[PDB]
Design a protein around this ligand. Structure first.
Ligand code: HEC
Length: 108
């Protein structure tokens, strides 16, 4: 244990103001700058179809779990050096948690 549920709501506002600019969560939503993330958990890194991921992601070969996703979220360039995710990070444990709670939810 090292991940505890957050507010899906709050969850859904970080996404909007922090991840939508680049991504969609929804089954059938398109890839934009980043890929769509519907069904992200359970799946491995860089496998959405019709998406051109860096060498980095693919190689990283990550199992998208909640616990992973949080450290990634802490610092992505750090997690997967060579990723094209120009996303600095979410330094707060709390913020991450609501986010992941939202993700857990909306991409299922
Ligand atoms: C645009 C400037 C982005 C923002 C803001 C966020 N992400 Fe991102 N994401 C982006 C790219 C360009 C890529 C692929 C990079 C590469 O190495 O090819 C990604 C990848 C992800 C992944 C990996 C998914 C996979 O299928 O392997 C995840 C899980 C992801 N992005 C989620 C995500 C979230 C939750 C964000 C908000 C806090 C977010 N990203 C921001 C581009 C952009």
């Amino acid at each position: 244990t090292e991940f505890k549920a957050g507010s899906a709501k709050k969850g859904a506002t970080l996404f909007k103001t922090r991840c939508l600019q680049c991504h969609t969560v929804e089954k059938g939503g398109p890839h934009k700058v980043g890929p769509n993330l519907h069904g992200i958990f359970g799946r491995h890194s860089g496998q959405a179809e019709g998406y051109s991921y860096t060498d980095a992601n693919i190689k990283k070969n990550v199992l998208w779990d909640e616990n992973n996703m949080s450290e990634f979220l802490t610092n992505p360039k750090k997690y997967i050096p060579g990723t094209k995710m120009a996303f600095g990070g979410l330094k707060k444990e709390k913020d991450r948690n609501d986010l992941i709670t939202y993700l857990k939810k909306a991409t299922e």
